[PDB]
Amino acid sequence: AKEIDVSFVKIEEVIGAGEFGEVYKGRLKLPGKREIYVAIKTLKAGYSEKQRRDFLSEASIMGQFDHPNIIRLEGVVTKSRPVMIITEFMENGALDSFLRQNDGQFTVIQLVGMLRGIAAGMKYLAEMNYVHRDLAARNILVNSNLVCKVSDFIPVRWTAPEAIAYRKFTSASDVWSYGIVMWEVMSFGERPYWDMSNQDVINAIEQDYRLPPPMDCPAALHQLMLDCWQKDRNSRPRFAEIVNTLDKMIRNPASL
């Protein structure tokens, strides 16, 4: 939680209207250092002091993390009003919109690279005993060189059955979500289970329906989704094995 002077920040265009408030693109120029682009998250106007505390405890959480695939926290503005959270800028926005606007324009190996980055960052999070519970493509950001970073610090079709039937949230149920993200990525942003209702998804998962391979999806990658969707949460691979599996595919591209 490093303290940033508001005068080192210029606020440019809006780039979203989040839960808590708006997100702006801006410029950060600290003394003696090269200017970088940043994302500036604000709290909705009129926020209460308890809403401020909640907001600033979100930042304390993101400041614990230092991983190439987790969104970097640059600092906070707390000495002046309004409060702001400064994070690193991701030029290409959320992964789901990004694939949807670039349908077919990335090779299989580039998509496995992004899936590998997401896994590495999920592994880091699991290793520090944080459960995300909202892992979806819309919560993954993409920078200018296609590096994917986990942000967002119940969506039924992304959630493991034991998190849709008994409120048990573990890294193992994050892995189920990761599988869904894999399907979203390989289909260039198709909606999981399409127009099925939330309850149709629940009933179909319970009778062992699983998503089919995306078009032109390697069998090996669809097998890894299927492993992520094992009914028993302990038969699912852990993020360590998912990273190692995808590293071996990137290296043995025949695997694909």
UniProtKB/Swiss-Prot annotation:
Ranges of the Cytoplasmic topological domain: 1-256
Binding site for ATP: I15, G16, A17, G18, E19, F20, G21, E22, V23, K41
GO molecular function: ATP binding; axon guidance receptor activity; protein-containing complex binding; transmembrane-ephrin receptor activity
The UniProt record lists the keyword Ribosomal protein: no
Domain annotation Protein kinase: ranges: 9-250
Keyword Ligase: no
Modification comment: Phosphorylated. Autophosphorylation is stimulated by the ligand EFNB1. Required for interaction with SH2 domain-containing interactors, for activation of the MAPK/ERK and JUN signaling cascades and for ubiquitination by CBL.
Organism superkingdom: Eukaryota
GO biological processes: angiogenesis; axon guidance; camera-type eye morphogenesis; cell chemotaxis; cell-substrate adhesion; central nervous system projection neuron axonogenesis; dendritic spine development; dendritic spine morphogenesis
Compartments, record wording: Cell membrane; Early endosome membrane; Cell projection, Dendrite
GO cellular-component term (any): endoplasmic reticulum
Cited function: Receptor tyrosine kinase which binds promiscuously transmembrane ephrin-B family ligands residing on adjacent cells, leading to contact-dependent bidirectional signaling into neighboring cells. The signaling pathway downstream of the receptor is referred to as forward signaling while the signaling pathway downstream of the ephrin ligand is referred to as reverse signaling. Cognate/functional ephrin ligands for this receptor include EFNB1, EFNB2 and EFNB3.
Annotated family: Belongs to the protein kinase superfamily. Tyr protein kinase family. Ephrin receptor subfamily.
Name recorded for this polypeptide: Ephrin type-B receptor 1
Species annotation: Homo sapiens (Human)
Name of the gene this protein is made from: EPHB1
Region of the whole protein represented: 611 to 888 of 984
